[PDB]
Design a protein around this ligand. Structure first.
Ligand SMILES: Nc1ncnc2c1ncn2[C@@H]1O[C@H](COP(=O)(O)OP(=O)(O)NP(=O)(O)O)[C@@H](O)[C@H]1O
Ligand SMILES: Nc1ncnc2c1ncn2[C@@H]1O[C@H](COP(=O)(O)OP(=O)(O)NP(=O)(O)O)[C@@H](O)[C@H]1O
Lengths: 691, 722
């Protein structure tokens, strides 16, 4: 499950490890050739996963030679996880970027492409350029997809062995491809593998975010409207293979599984994680909390230990700062108005006895180097030189080791966030890459968070334990109590969310159906058989409206049928004439004459234009009618859902009823798609010369 | 004007430079003793400005030895500007922070203190700590003032030769110094010299920002029936006199609550200093406002190396789409010659448009995305790299130097074990890039739109052409830009929509550039006119606060306040008796059923005085007044024999200060209510400004007389068990 699959993966790592000597002997150009060899074997029927050891050994030697970086064993494990339908949890500083080169290479081999998905355009370009030398070294091409990029350049990016771009541009390209009128206009290939770089934002926070293409199609002054829509969740769901990465930034494993059927695997850190996460401390009042924070700081800084303090607001950043100053403790506040000051502060935040106050600390942040960053120190130098550097490093080693000795970076959370993943991000700022460190969070009985115990009498019991000034005790049940509360908030929030996804699933299955139909049309030149086929459906249904099947003549509405055929099929037949003249004519033979006549008329239009022109007109009419009924259906499904509140209630589930109305409305649209296609083809004015 | 100042100052620079060998020959200890020598000369009557050449030369040699930096000739000039009541406009890259050591030193010599004013606490602390070794080398002490610092520590910081702190904290300390009950509680000295490190924000943007101390430190048709009745209001006295404003605010209204205890704006704080100066980059445009608000002259200091950035004619297009296309073509032409470009925009949405368009054109670039700060700093690093293109959205002022060719810093700043070979390689390869960027024209700046504030446009353009580097800038405009509403004519603007700009056919008109600059200047000036009216309202409050605090500080500074008390008690007793006995009046026209209970009620003074006058028909009105004063003195001296002189003198003083503070706080509240009650009372016609200044000064005058009365009433009625 975790260490069952991990102990199985460790066996493979040993084999990759056992292969390095073999790989070290290989020439650069022999490493290049392995890719072609792997593909030959796949062509002969080999199973991809059988290639992982050799493939991963190849990638690791290529990196060594190219980046001067050798994947660690835990990065091998990470890369195996990402080949499966999984989230690899890898802690910050663990080299997720380099790890991702592994499953990208592996899943590039079948020739079906890879989509590495980034949170923004800077990272897509940056990661494509950084990795392009590695992948070219192994005979693979690298694409980059950006907004604004012309279609032929996008096709090229999707045609590469491995592609980089944001979630957004991938999703938009998919939508635009399902508005194409010829398959050649498509930019994407089949959606094979999506490797998602930060799944918390991309897959969880953005799951239900619609991606929309809008337009003034406004067939009938004229408005904007949705022409094509998909949510992120339902986009990523289209891929054959989906995987992603995040930091020990978890608490949401159950959600990945619900939303995506993604398992999450906790990947072990390269070095033992030794940060001491100390029990949560609870105080009656904010003031006694702050005095406690100040006394911890005072104590640790006197020992040489740097501290980073996270708060939830500027106001609270100010308060602890003023109180530190009142206590004589030098520090810096990270002030979001002064970015240059911020980078300068951050740089020396791991310096002996440094104290930094940060307001709503981000995810990941700049690494805090213990003892200071000495690279900032030469960065400063205007003519850096040898003896000069060496003195700096050597003075730094001493500081670094003194900071480690003193316990590494201490993190203080002055409050907890309602989301523990945020708390976890702050805390993860310390103890990176094996470094000594610690963390402590402070709560008061005032703290907003003491409100997710949805009871003022419950919470205020903790008062009767006392919290008594200096005479703190520590109670670790509190830490788990608080963690559990945070768990229940997420879980409550997700139940709500999961109901909203069950509504989303109605639109998803409708979209999937209409698009797969649209794509079957798009993929062929000749839509004849379908046309012929729906023509009989349309005439049957149209005739049934005036001639109830197997009715006597007296129930028939021939006047009404005649006009209908005139009005909608430009088909003006003397049906009354027929009946009143042939006492042979039964209902079935009337149905045929009518059908036959439509056909004869259409065949002469074809004779004028030519077959090819006609085949492509049919196809375009189908796609175009499909598109405009879908647009109309999207708008109507939107009105339907937003009116979900007072429709299903007296023992019926709303939904059950929405699913009913939705089914009925989708069913009707497909009938109406056949109607409108045959109506258009029937009515197309062609100007006819003689014979 | 600027030409003559700089001429005379270039003369002094030549003297300074001639002194360098004298200073070079001095031991470090001899250099330090220059300070004491300057001060022995000042004690003997030397004029401070006679010292500038030697003192500057001393600071310049000190900086060489401590910092390994020798002030440039232009930094000497900036330093001389800053010793006068002037703004030294010194371009981004020019070493403002080092420049400021010079006037700080010199203005520290008289032993009266220097306040260096920074924008934030980081910079205060950093500057203080960076300059401490420099000023200690020269025999001076440096202080740092921060929020939360205990008063003893604040005292120490202000008692240092030079102090660093934010504007905010300086002003707050001033307010709290004026809430002190003894002079030894004060943390500041007399406000001598304020050197303001970036005056655009500190002096202009924030001129009118109130600093406020609040404190729980309170104590406790339709008009007609409201008006009628009760213990306060009942004569038939208007509920909406200025007088009765707190009352009316009460009916407006129908725990304990916090009020303003003290307030001052930055602009009025800084005007308290004996000397004021400050710095900013070539931004100007606001010289007229500095001069008008602060009486600061603005001297534009030349750059150390010639400033050769080529600031090209503004270009105007009919449509935004036409503008964007022109911006893309130029970026295309320049990047093909290897020249890097910085594109500044006014919106995220504008960035995304230009960016997507550059991608449609196959032009590699990076947007600076506000969400991704670590990306943004990596971007800025390579922004001066050949053919680099960077899009920034409402870029700030100054910002991080873009090094041409790239920073040969950031490259080794990512290299964890260099050598001679390596860096040497890095640096050599960087020189070729650098030299090629220079030769391609340096950094080209594109303003895709102009801001309403030309100062902002000038900041953006100033990122190019630093420290003598080649560079250029060009601003783009279209008829669809919000900036065409800075001209107040729809139709005047539309004659560009008659000289209608066409496809492969650019011209250029210098009058357009001039016309836009002039429109932005007419906008600045219109905004400042609006602001000046507001500063007039502020001047009413400043006048009253300056007067009240000057009174308060006189009291605080005197150990013994008896003579002030005795003097005001006669004042008070004379007027009070005037209210019932008209001067030189015959006994006939005297009211005592009003006078007797007045004295009893307001002063615990019960002198059955009709029965003097029944018993003695021989005293007369003046010897009557004499006796009435005499008695209160009697009762008073008696309370004091019980209490102690000392104890009494300090009680009287505290009572005067507490009364003044109560009356003052009440006045601040009533004025705040008048000022907003001065939005709709009866037309902006019958001048609302003017009437408010009158009622306000009227209430101020009233409060001054009421401060006398209340003190004497407090001192008359005070209980001591005999
Ligand atoms: N196997 C390795 N050998 C040498 N250096 C490495 C190795 N793996 C990673 N690095 C470096 O270690 C740092 C961590 O990179 P990164 O993947 O950005 O860390 P992360 O926190 O897990 N990921 P992210 O924040 O998404 O970029 C980078 O500076 C890498 O270049
Ligand atoms: N005379 C000098 N000799 C050598 N280096 C100097 C000298 N003057 C300044 N520098 C350096 O030039 C840089 C400029 O930064 P700084 O003085 O803060 O801002 P500026 O734009 O230069 N003016 P301002 O930003 O308001 O101070 C700093 O690295 C200084 O250390």
């Amino acid at each position: 499950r975790n260490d069952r699959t991990l102990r199985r993966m460790r066996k493979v790592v040993n084999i990759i490890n056992a292969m390095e000597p073999e790989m070290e002997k290989l020439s650069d150009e022999e490493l290049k050739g392995k890719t072609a060899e792997f593909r030959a074997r796949l062509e002969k029927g080999e199973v991809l996963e059988n290639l992982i050891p050799e493939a991963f050994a190849v990638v690791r030697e290529a990196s060594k030679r190219v980046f001067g970086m050798r994947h660690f064993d835990v990065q091998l494990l990470g890369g195996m996880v990402l080949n499966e339908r999984c989230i690899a949890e890898m802690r910050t500083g663990e080299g997720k970027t380099l790890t991702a080169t592994l499953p990208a290479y592996l899943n590039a081999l079948t020739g079906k492409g890879v989509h590495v998905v980034t949170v923004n355009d800077y990272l897509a370009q940056r990661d494509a350029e950084n990795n392009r030398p590695l992948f070219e070294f192994l005979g693979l091409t690298v694409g980059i997809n950006l907004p604004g990029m012309p279609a032929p350049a996008k096709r090229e990016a999707y045609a590469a062995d491995i592609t980089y771009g944001t979630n957004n541009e991938y999703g938009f390209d998919y939508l635009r491809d399902n508005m194409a009128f010829s398959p050649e206009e498509r930019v994407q290939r089949k959606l094979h593998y999506a490797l998602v770089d930060e799944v918390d934002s991309i897959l969880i926070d953005e799951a239900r975010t619609p991606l929309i293409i809008s337009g003034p199609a406004e067939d009938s002054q004229n408005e904007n409207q949705t022409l094509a829509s998909i949510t992120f969740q339902n986009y990523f769901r289209l891929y054959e293979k989906l995987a992603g990465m995040t930091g020990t930034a978890d608490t949401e494993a159950f959600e990945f599984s619900s939303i995506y059927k993604l398992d999450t695997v906790v990947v072990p850190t390269n070095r033992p994680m030794i940060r001491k996460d100390l029990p949560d401390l609870v105080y009656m009042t904010e003031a006694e909390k702050i005095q406690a924070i100040i006394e911890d700081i005072k104590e640790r800084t006197a020992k040489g230990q740097p501290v980073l303090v996270g708060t939830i607001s500027i106001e609270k950043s100010e308060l602890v700062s003023n109180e530190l100053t009142k206590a004589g403790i030098k520090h810096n506040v990270l002030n979001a108005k002064f970015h240059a000051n911020e980078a300068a502060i951050v740089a020396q935040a791991g310096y002996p006895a440094a104290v930094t106050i940060a307001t709503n600390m981000a995810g990941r942040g700049t690494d805090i180097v213990l003892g200071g960053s000495w690279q900032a120190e030469v960065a400063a130098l205007e003519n850096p030189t040898a003896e000069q550097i060496e003195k700096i490093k050597a003075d730094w080693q001493v500081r670094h080791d003194a900071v480690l000795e003193a316990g590494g970076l201490h993190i203080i959370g002055t409050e907890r966030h309602e989301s523990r993943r945020i708390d976890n991000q702050l805390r993860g700022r310390s103890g990176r890459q094996g470094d000594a460190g610690s963390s402590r969070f402070y709560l008061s009985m005032e703290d907003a968070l003491m409100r997710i115990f949805a009871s003022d009498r419950v919470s205020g019991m903790m008062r009767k334990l006392g919290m008594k000034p200096g005479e703190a005790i520590e109670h670790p049940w509190v830490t788990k109590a608080i963690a559990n509360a945070q768990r229940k908030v997420e879980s409550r929030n997700f139940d709500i969310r999961k109901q909203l996804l069950e509504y989303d699933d109605v639109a998803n299955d409708q979209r999937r159906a209409i698009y797969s139909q649209r794509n079957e049309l798009l993929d062929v030149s000749d839509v004849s058989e379908t046309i012929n086929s729906i023509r009989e459906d349309v005439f049957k249904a149209t005739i049934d409206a005036y001639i109830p099947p197997q009715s006597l003549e007296e129930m028939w509405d021939i006047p009404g049928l005649q006009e209908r055929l005139k009005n909608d099929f430009d088909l003006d037949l003397p049906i009354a004439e027929w009946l009143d003249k042939e006492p042979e004519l039964h209902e079935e033979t009337l149905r045929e004459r009518i059908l036959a006549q439509s056909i004869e008329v259409y065949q002469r239009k074809e004779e004028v234009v030519g077959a090819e022109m006609m085949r492509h007109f049919e196809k375009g009419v189908m796609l175009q009618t499909l598109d405009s009924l879908w647009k109309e259906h999207l708008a109507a499904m939107d009105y339907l859902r937003q009116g979900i509140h007072l429709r299903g209630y007296a023992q019926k589930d709303p939904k059950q009823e929405y699913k009913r109305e939705s089914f009925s409305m989708f069913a009707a649209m497909l009938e109406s798609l056949k109607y409108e296609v045959i109506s258009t083809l029937s009515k197309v004015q062609v100007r006819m010369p003689e014979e």
